[PDB]
Amino acid sequence: MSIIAINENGFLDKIKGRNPLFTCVISSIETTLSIPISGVHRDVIKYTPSADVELVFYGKSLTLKTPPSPTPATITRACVELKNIKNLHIDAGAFVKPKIPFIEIDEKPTGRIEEGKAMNNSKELYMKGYLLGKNLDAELLIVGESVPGGTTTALGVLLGLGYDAEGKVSSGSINNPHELKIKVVREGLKKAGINEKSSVFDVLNAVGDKMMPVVAGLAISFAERNKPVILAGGTQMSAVLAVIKEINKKVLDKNLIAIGTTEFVLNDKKGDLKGIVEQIGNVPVLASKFYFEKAKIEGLKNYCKGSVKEGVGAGGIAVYSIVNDLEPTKIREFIENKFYEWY
Amino acid sequence: MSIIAINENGFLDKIKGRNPLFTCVISSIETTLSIPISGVHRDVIKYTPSADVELVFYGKSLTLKTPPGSPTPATITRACVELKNIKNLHIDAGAFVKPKIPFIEIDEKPTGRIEEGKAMNNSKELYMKGYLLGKNLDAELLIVGESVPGGTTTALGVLLGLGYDAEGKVSSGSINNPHELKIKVVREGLKKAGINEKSSVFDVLNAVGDKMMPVVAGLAISFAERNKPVILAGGTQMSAVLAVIKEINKKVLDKNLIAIGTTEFVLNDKKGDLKGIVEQIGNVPVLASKFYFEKAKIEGLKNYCKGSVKEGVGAGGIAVYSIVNDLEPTKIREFIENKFYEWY
Ligand SMILES: Cc1cc2ncn([C@H]3O[C@H](COP(=O)(O)O)[C@@H](O)[C@H]3O)c2cc1C
Ligand SMILES: O=C(O)c1ccc[n+]([C@@H]2O[C@H](COP(=O)([O-])O)[C@@H](O)[C@H]2O)c1
Ligand SMILES: O=C(O)c1cccnc1
């Protein structure tokens, strides 16, 4: 098969033939404007998350001339079309808003991580995600993210919750500035005073990003109804998985929540995803194989060398798509064919 | 029993059992900040739509200290979501003040000045967005309402611009129904915009429509294309929407999946003629919910029997679904009296 399943625990059977809703949660981080923590090029980073979800929902970016080595939203759009997957998208603080219809949970971007001032309202954000979740329906929730800099806020949250994660976080590019990232989050974990006294929300408030409580609410509201949730992302979704255990360890016991990502994230050298998960729980981690070795866009080959890797729920929706008899090469063909248009 | 049906045509069974999505589309009109076309108090008109959908989704209003002079019909909508656990997501298409609850933002800019013929310039694009959003919503039945202060005026202008006999037929928010101020406004606007019979539905919407109209059109046509039923939960405003649905896609109408769902207070409004608008449009089920509000225990609710508020926020349409699916009508009225002091 083209699906690496670690701690599968029956899950892939849970999502076979089930009707999905896909949703991507986007956010922007103040720090990224002046500190190069993110692998998203600075000329497009204010526009990248919205252009991502526009490409998924509508088939064309509008906030940019082209989409953002192409954006992983290319893979997410591939699966949306190739398997006709309904998708709605959520804003929790992107600098520039989507010109497609979208759900507005929070207009204000994630603040400056290095100051312990990520956000003053992570619990409110959590409740909005759960309430929003209560009013969505499907047999399965595939929930992704588009947060430039999200691997840095993922580091702080994991660390702030007492996990061992240095060097373990991934990145949206080949280079992975782990030292800058550690320096950034440590400064704000300290300015905000996070210790082992602190709640999950104290930590999110210091160094998290606003996508995280929202996706936490969504996931728990869906798992509580014994509906499976595919946390579609890499490193970042292990921070959310962690946050979900600090919020309701009970539902996590239910076995209804799996991380779904790409081969390029599972098999990433400059990080260690399964190591972080291990410290959290016996949770299914599922990577999807895309065979971009045999590609015809050298932008797509570049995924095999650490360019991009993941994002916009690409890996987890591919997992879903592939479990439901999608030929994994179609993804590569789709992007291949649509490429000249988009760019 | 508790449901009056014009040309029911079997629609009632098509909706029994099926599980619904309720969505309210809100908007605001610049014209209501200067001209008294609307029955909403001027002091809270800028803040009403947002507060209405707050009440319905979250159980209480946040932009105002209390829900929106009589009591807003969101209480009716609110009541029904809790009693039949109707899932609900709400849509903004130009309200002055955005809601504090999670909402789908389609257009932040309000509806323009009706009298100048400058309601909007993106009606076709708003319809394409409502349609594409429809595609990505899943339910067995869509119940789509609205909350647009001044919306009976834009409904009149749209109906008149499309060649209908609609004067004196639109209903109103409060007991008073300034029909001729309404007519001067939209006729002024139609003239400035140059609408005549060669104009398109979108030219008309851009002259004197409101932005919720084409969004609801898109939502309704997408669900009905997929053979799902659709309740347009509104009064005369939804007859304007119904007219719009017919210009855009006549044949979907002919699939008998789209009905209007309103209150008894609208269908029995002598200061209006909902029935008469719709028979010029086509043979479409018109369904109204009986509330038995004279047995009411708060005069504000009771005030409905005399023409205050009447309808709004999918209240009539959401009740039709909640009654067709075996909810006892009085539970609505006894719900709103139990919490009247919490809200107020
Ligand atoms: C062009 C491009 C578009 C993307 N959209 C999402 N991601 C992905 O990379 C980001 C996280 O990595 P970091 O911590 O380096 O910001 C997220 O936005 C994730 O969705 C992208 C990555 C790239 C290169
Ligand atoms: O469409 C109708 O027939 C109708 C009848 C009574 C009340 N309404 C509600 O009141 C507003 C429209 O009425 P008006 O008088 O402000 O044009 C808007 O908020 C609607 O939800 C609408
Ligand atoms: O592991 C992640 O979360 C990740 C890696 C690369 C790009 N975006 C996200």
PDB file of C-alpha atoms in Angstrom, chain A residues 162-299:
ATOM      1  CA  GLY A 162       6.846  19.833  29.494  1.00  0.00           C
ATOM      2  CA  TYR A 163       7.530  17.680  26.427  1.00  0.00           C
ATOM      3  CA  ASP A 164      10.950  16.997  24.935  1.00  0.00           C
ATOM      4  CA  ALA A 165      10.753  18.508  21.451  1.00  0.00           C
ATOM      5  CA  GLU A 166      13.935  20.483  20.678  1.00  0.00           C
ATOM      6  CA  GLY A 167      15.236  19.505  17.253  1.00  0.00           C
ATOM      7  CA  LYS A 168      12.058  17.483  16.754  1.00  0.00           C
ATOM      8  CA  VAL A 169       9.872  20.096  15.004  1.00  0.00           C
ATOM      9  CA  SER A 170       9.539  20.087  11.208  1.00  0.00           C
ATOM     10  CA  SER A 171       9.578  23.038   8.809  1.00  0.00           C
ATOM     11  CA  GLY A 172       8.027  24.340   5.615  1.00  0.00           C
ATOM     12  CA  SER A 173      11.345  24.226   3.765  1.00  0.00           C
ATOM     13  CA  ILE A 174      14.686  22.421   3.564  1.00  0.00           C
ATOM     14  CA  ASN A 175      16.401  24.659   6.146  1.00  0.00           C
ATOM     15  CA  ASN A 176      15.185  24.242   9.743  1.00  0.00           C
ATOM     16  CA  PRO A 177      16.373  27.080  12.076  1.00  0.00           C
ATOM     17  CA  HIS A 178      15.976  25.093  15.287  1.00  0.00           C
ATOM     18  CA  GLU A 179      18.211  27.473  17.264  1.00  0.00           C
ATOM     19  CA  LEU A 180      16.286  30.594  16.284  1.00  0.00           C
ATOM     20  CA  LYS A 181      13.063  28.679  16.976  1.00  0.00           C
ATOM     21  CA  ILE A 182      14.202  27.564  20.440  1.00  0.00           C
ATOM     22  CA  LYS A 183      15.440  31.080  21.212  1.00  0.00           C
ATOM     23  CA  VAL A 184      12.113  32.621  20.114  1.00  0.00           C
ATOM     24  CA  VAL A 185       9.791  30.385  22.114  1.00  0.00           C
ATOM     25  CA  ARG A 186      12.008  30.215  25.228  1.00  0.00           C
ATOM     26  CA  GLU A 187      12.025  34.022  25.407  1.00  0.00           C
ATOM     27  CA  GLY A 188       8.215  34.115  25.439  1.00  0.00           C
ATOM     28  CA  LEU A 189       7.801  31.054  27.637  1.00  0.00           C
ATOM     29  CA  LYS A 190       9.938  33.064  30.078  1.00  0.00           C
ATOM     30  CA  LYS A 191       8.393  36.520  29.595  1.00  0.00           C
ATOM     31  CA  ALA A 192       4.999  34.903  30.209  1.00  0.00           C
ATOM     32  CA  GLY A 193       6.248  32.825  33.140  1.00  0.00           C
ATOM     33  CA  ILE A 194       5.171  29.386  31.949  1.00  0.00           C
ATOM     34  CA  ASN A 195       6.074  26.656  34.441  1.00  0.00           C
ATOM     35  CA  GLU A 196       4.431  23.425  35.557  1.00  0.00           C
ATOM     36  CA  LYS A 197       1.772  25.520  37.343  1.00  0.00           C
ATOM     37  CA  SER A 198       0.360  26.637  33.995  1.00  0.00           C
ATOM     38  CA  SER A 199      -2.754  25.397  32.217  1.00  0.00           C
ATOM     39  CA  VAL A 200      -2.851  24.471  28.535  1.00  0.00           C
ATOM     40  CA  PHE A 201      -4.335  27.947  27.927  1.00  0.00           C
ATOM     41  CA  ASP A 202      -1.609  29.813  29.812  1.00  0.00           C
ATOM     42  CA  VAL A 203       0.804  28.163  27.345  1.00  0.00           C
ATOM     43  CA  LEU A 204      -1.239  28.741  24.181  1.00  0.00           C
ATOM     44  CA  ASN A 205      -1.678  32.323  25.400  1.00  0.00           C
ATOM     45  CA  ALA A 206       2.105  32.673  25.663  1.00  0.00           C
ATOM     46  CA  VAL A 207       3.524  30.862  22.626  1.00  0.00           C
ATOM     47  CA  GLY A 208       0.707  29.021  20.798  1.00  0.00           C
ATOM     48  CA  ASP A 209      -1.003  30.026  17.583  1.00  0.00           C
ATOM     49  CA  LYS A 210      -4.755  30.654  17.270  1.00  0.00           C
ATOM     50  CA  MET A 211      -5.331  27.705  14.894  1.00  0.00           C
ATOM     51  CA  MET A 212      -4.562  25.335  17.769  1.00  0.00           C
ATOM     52  CA  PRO A 213      -7.472  25.881  20.231  1.00  0.00           C
ATOM     53  CA  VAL A 214      -9.927  26.064  17.312  1.00  0.00           C
ATOM     54  CA  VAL A 215      -8.775  22.750  15.815  1.00  0.00           C
ATOM     55  CA  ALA A 216      -8.825  21.335  19.360  1.00  0.00           C
ATOM     56  CA  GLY A 217     -12.472  22.340  19.821  1.00  0.00           C
ATOM     57  CA  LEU A 218     -13.454  21.028  16.392  1.00  0.00           C
ATOM     58  CA  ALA A 219     -11.764  17.686  17.031  1.00  0.00           C
ATOM     59  CA  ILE A 220     -13.207  17.099  20.503  1.00  0.00           C
ATOM     60  CA  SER A 221     -16.722  18.115  19.449  1.00  0.00           C
ATOM     61  CA  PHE A 222     -16.456  15.540  16.656  1.00  0.00           C
ATOM     62  CA  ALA A 223     -14.812  12.766  18.727  1.00  0.00           C
ATOM     63  CA  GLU A 224     -17.343  13.308  21.533  1.00  0.00           C
ATOM     64  CA  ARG A 225     -19.965  12.210  18.991  1.00  0.00           C
ATOM     65  CA  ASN A 226     -17.822   9.104  18.343  1.00  0.00           C
ATOM     66  CA  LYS A 227     -16.997  10.471  14.880  1.00  0.00           C
ATOM     67  CA  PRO A 228     -13.419   9.998  13.657  1.00  0.00           C
ATOM     68  CA  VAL A 229     -11.218  13.067  13.231  1.00  0.00           C
ATOM     69  CA  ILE A 230      -8.110  13.150  11.032  1.00  0.00           C
ATOM     70  CA  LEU A 231      -5.826  15.820  12.456  1.00  0.00           C
ATOM     71  CA  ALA A 232      -4.387  16.649   9.022  1.00  0.00           C
ATOM     72  CA  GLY A 233      -0.869  18.024   9.501  1.00  0.00           C
ATOM     73  CA  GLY A 234       2.585  17.219  10.821  1.00  0.00           C
ATOM     74  CA  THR A 235       4.531  18.634  13.769  1.00  0.00           C
ATOM     75  CA  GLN A 236       1.844  21.262  14.272  1.00  0.00           C
ATOM     76  CA  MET A 237      -0.899  18.663  14.705  1.00  0.00           C
ATOM     77  CA  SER A 238       1.140  16.869  17.360  1.00  0.00           C
ATOM     78  CA  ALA A 239       1.027  20.116  19.326  1.00  0.00           C
ATOM     79  CA  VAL A 240      -2.774  20.149  18.823  1.00  0.00           C
ATOM     80  CA  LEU A 241      -2.994  16.468  19.753  1.00  0.00           C
ATOM     81  CA  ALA A 242      -1.054  17.384  22.899  1.00  0.00           C
ATOM     82  CA  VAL A 243      -3.425  20.284  23.597  1.00  0.00           C
ATOM     83  CA  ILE A 244      -6.374  17.916  23.148  1.00  0.00           C
ATOM     84  CA  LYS A 245      -5.032  15.653  25.905  1.00  0.00           C
ATOM     85  CA  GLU A 246      -4.634  18.614  28.280  1.00  0.00           C
ATOM     86  CA  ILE A 247      -8.283  19.494  27.550  1.00  0.00           C
ATOM     87  CA  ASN A 248     -10.092  16.139  27.540  1.00  0.00           C
ATOM     88  CA  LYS A 249      -7.818  13.117  27.899  1.00  0.00           C
ATOM     89  CA  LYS A 250     -11.065  11.111  27.953  1.00  0.00           C
ATOM     90  CA  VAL A 251     -11.935  11.524  24.261  1.00  0.00           C
ATOM     91  CA  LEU A 252      -8.307  10.782  23.373  1.00  0.00           C
ATOM     92  CA  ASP A 253      -8.902   7.425  25.035  1.00  0.00           C
ATOM     93  CA  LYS A 254     -11.680   6.874  22.464  1.00  0.00           C
ATOM     94  CA  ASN A 255      -9.169   6.124  19.638  1.00  0.00           C
ATOM     95  CA  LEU A 256     -11.067   8.416  17.251  1.00  0.00           C
ATOM     96  CA  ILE A 257      -8.260  10.930  16.612  1.00  0.00           C
ATOM     97  CA  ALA A 258      -5.331  10.245  14.303  1.00  0.00           C
ATOM     98  CA  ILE A 259      -2.629  12.498  12.888  1.00  0.00           C
ATOM     99  CA  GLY A 260      -2.591  12.374   9.108  1.00  0.00           C
ATOM    100  CA  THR A 261       0.437  13.753   7.269  1.00  0.00           C
ATOM    101  CA  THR A 262       2.802  13.064   4.356  1.00  0.00           C
ATOM    102  CA  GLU A 263       5.727  10.706   3.828  1.00  0.00           C
ATOM    103  CA  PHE A 264       7.912  13.842   3.644  1.00  0.00           C
ATOM    104  CA  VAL A 265       7.032  14.592   7.278  1.00  0.00           C
ATOM    105  CA  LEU A 266       7.134  11.116   8.800  1.00  0.00           C
ATOM    106  CA  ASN A 267      10.519  10.364   7.174  1.00  0.00           C
ATOM    107  CA  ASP A 268      11.966  13.841   7.898  1.00  0.00           C
ATOM    108  CA  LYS A 269      15.590  13.842   9.051  1.00  0.00           C
ATOM    109  CA  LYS A 270      15.771  17.372  10.520  1.00  0.00           C
ATOM    110  CA  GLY A 271      12.764  16.470  12.778  1.00  0.00           C
ATOM    111  CA  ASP A 272      11.210  13.565  14.656  1.00  0.00           C
ATOM    112  CA  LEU A 273       7.410  13.405  14.503  1.00  0.00           C
ATOM    113  CA  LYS A 274       6.833   9.885  15.852  1.00  0.00           C
ATOM    114  CA  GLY A 275       9.063  10.700  18.807  1.00  0.00           C
ATOM    115  CA  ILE A 276       6.849  13.600  19.866  1.00  0.00           C
ATOM    116  CA  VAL A 277       3.684  11.529  19.396  1.00  0.00           C
ATOM    117  CA  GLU A 278       5.169   8.673  21.449  1.00  0.00           C
ATOM    118  CA  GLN A 279       5.642  11.052  24.391  1.00  0.00           C
ATOM    119  CA  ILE A 280       1.928  12.008  24.046  1.00  0.00           C
ATOM    120  CA  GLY A 281       0.049   8.737  23.559  1.00  0.00           C
ATOM    121  CA  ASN A 282      -0.648   5.623  21.519  1.00  0.00           C
ATOM    122  CA  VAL A 283      -2.234   7.590  18.659  1.00  0.00           C
ATOM    123  CA  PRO A 284      -2.398   6.526  14.978  1.00  0.00           C
ATOM    124  CA  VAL A 285       0.081   8.426  12.818  1.00  0.00           C
ATOM    125  CA  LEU A 286      -0.619   7.982   9.118  1.00  0.00           C
ATOM    126  CA  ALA A 287       1.537   9.269   6.262  1.00  0.00           C
ATOM    127  CA  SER A 288       0.537   9.251   2.608  1.00  0.00           C
ATOM    128  CA  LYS A 289       2.913   8.380  -0.213  1.00  0.00           C
ATOM    129  CA  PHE A 290       2.837  10.522  -3.344  1.00  0.00           C
ATOM    130  CA  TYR A 291       5.667   9.072  -5.467  1.00  0.00           C
ATOM    131  CA  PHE A 292       6.975  12.518  -6.398  1.00  0.00           C
ATOM    132  CA  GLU A 293      10.282  10.811  -7.187  1.00  0.00           C
ATOM    133  CA  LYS A 294       8.781   9.893 -10.608  1.00  0.00           C
ATOM    134  CA  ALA A 295       7.328  13.392 -11.076  1.00  0.00           C
ATOM    135  CA  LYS A 296       7.419  15.770 -14.036  1.00  0.00           C
ATOM    136  CA  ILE A 297       7.486  19.127 -12.199  1.00  0.00           C
ATOM    137  CA  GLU A 298      10.825  19.652 -10.553  1.00  0.00           C
ATOM    138  CA  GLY A 299       8.825  21.732  -8.095  1.00  0.00           C
TER     139      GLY A 299
END
